[PDB]
PDB file of C-alpha atoms in Angstrom:
ATOM      1  CA  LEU C   1    -110.878  21.588 126.989  1.00  0.00           C
ATOM      2  CA  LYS C   2    -108.817  22.152 130.168  1.00  0.00           C
ATOM      3  CA  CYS C   3    -109.184  23.350 133.576  1.00  0.00           C
ATOM      4  CA  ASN C   4    -106.841  24.649 135.874  1.00  0.00           C
ATOM      5  CA  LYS C   5    -105.829  22.694 139.317  1.00  0.00           C
ATOM      6  CA  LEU C   6    -106.372  23.853 142.903  1.00  0.00           C
ATOM      7  CA  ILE C   7    -102.948  25.215 142.968  1.00  0.00           C
ATOM      8  CA  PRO C   8    -102.763  27.899 140.003  1.00  0.00           C
ATOM      9  CA  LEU C   9    -100.029  26.289 137.890  1.00  0.00           C
ATOM     10  CA  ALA C  10    -101.227  22.373 137.332  1.00  0.00           C
ATOM     11  CA  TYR C  11    -103.900  21.575 135.001  1.00  0.00           C
ATOM     12  CA  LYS C  12    -105.860  18.680 133.841  1.00  0.00           C
ATOM     13  CA  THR C  13    -108.166  17.639 130.732  1.00  0.00           C
ATOM     14  CA  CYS C  14    -111.753  17.333 131.095  1.00  0.00           C
ATOM     15  CA  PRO C  15    -112.279  13.552 130.853  1.00  0.00           C
ATOM     16  CA  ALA C  16    -114.863  11.560 128.791  1.00  0.00           C
ATOM     17  CA  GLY C  17    -118.271  13.537 128.531  1.00  0.00           C
ATOM     18  CA  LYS C  18    -116.553  16.433 130.742  1.00  0.00           C
ATOM     19  CA  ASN C  19    -116.097  19.339 128.450  1.00  0.00           C
ATOM     20  CA  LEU C  20    -116.988  22.257 130.935  1.00  0.00           C
ATOM     21  CA  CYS C  21    -114.961  23.624 133.741  1.00  0.00           C
ATOM     22  CA  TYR C  22    -116.403  24.252 137.011  1.00  0.00           C
ATOM     23  CA  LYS C  23    -115.393  25.700 140.570  1.00  0.00           C
ATOM     24  CA  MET C  24    -116.725  25.190 144.049  1.00  0.00           C
ATOM     25  CA  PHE C  25    -116.628  28.303 145.968  1.00  0.00           C
ATOM     26  CA  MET C  26    -117.470  28.312 149.702  1.00  0.00           C
ATOM     27  CA  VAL C  27    -119.630  31.310 151.602  1.00  0.00           C
ATOM     28  CA  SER C  28    -116.617  31.284 153.960  1.00  0.00           C
ATOM     29  CA  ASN C  29    -114.755  32.921 151.141  1.00  0.00           C
ATOM     30  CA  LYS C  30    -116.558  33.584 148.115  1.00  0.00           C
ATOM     31  CA  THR C  31    -113.465  35.387 146.582  1.00  0.00           C
ATOM     32  CA  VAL C  32    -111.523  32.285 147.139  1.00  0.00           C
ATOM     33  CA  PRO C  33    -112.298  28.745 145.681  1.00  0.00           C
ATOM     34  CA  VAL C  34    -112.616  25.543 147.625  1.00  0.00           C
ATOM     35  CA  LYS C  35    -112.659  23.181 144.597  1.00  0.00           C
ATOM     36  CA  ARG C  36    -112.029  23.019 141.029  1.00  0.00           C
ATOM     37  CA  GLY C  37    -112.359  20.795 138.030  1.00  0.00           C
ATOM     38  CA  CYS C  38    -114.385  19.905 134.872  1.00  0.00           C
ATOM     39  CA  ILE C  39    -117.988  19.157 134.621  1.00  0.00           C
ATOM     40  CA  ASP C  40    -120.314  17.723 131.816  1.00  0.00           C
ATOM     41  CA  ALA C  41    -123.170  20.022 132.780  1.00  0.00           C
ATOM     42  CA  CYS C  42    -123.151  23.277 134.135  1.00  0.00           C
ATOM     43  CA  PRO C  43    -124.289  22.886 137.798  1.00  0.00           C
ATOM     44  CA  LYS C  44    -126.692  24.762 139.991  1.00  0.00           C
ATOM     45  CA  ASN C  45    -125.484  27.386 142.384  1.00  0.00           C
ATOM     46  CA  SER C  46    -126.459  27.268 146.293  1.00  0.00           C
ATOM     47  CA  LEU C  47    -126.343  29.816 148.883  1.00  0.00           C
ATOM     48  CA  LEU C  48    -123.604  27.920 150.888  1.00  0.00           C
ATOM     49  CA  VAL C  49    -121.877  26.823 147.732  1.00  0.00           C
ATOM     50  CA  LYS C  50    -121.484  28.678 144.821  1.00  0.00           C
ATOM     51  CA  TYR C  51    -120.727  26.809 141.448  1.00  0.00           C
ATOM     52  CA  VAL C  52    -119.546  28.786 138.354  1.00  0.00           C
ATOM     53  CA  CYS C  53    -119.045  26.940 135.140  1.00  0.00           C
ATOM     54  CA  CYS C  54    -116.889  28.227 132.297  1.00  0.00           C
ATOM     55  CA  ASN C  55    -116.473  27.342 128.574  1.00  0.00           C
ATOM     56  CA  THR C  56    -112.598  28.540 128.406  1.00  0.00           C
ATOM     57  CA  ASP C  57    -109.285  27.382 129.121  1.00  0.00           C
ATOM     58  CA  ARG C  58    -107.740  27.533 132.236  1.00  0.00           C
ATOM     59  CA  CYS C  59    -110.667  29.537 132.755  1.00  0.00           C
ATOM     60  CA  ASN C  60    -110.804  28.129 136.620  1.00  0.00           C
TER      61      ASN C  60
END
């Protein structure tokens, strides 16, 4: 699986153990991402930072 980078054009494969994609959003703008990468296990969402996982290509 591959996930997009911070800038919508670059991407990187999810490392050993990481076969899931995730995105870190901040209350400041839940409509725009703060961080993007891959993850091993789908994380827990927060009130301040919202985490969204996906099992698709260039999902995030």
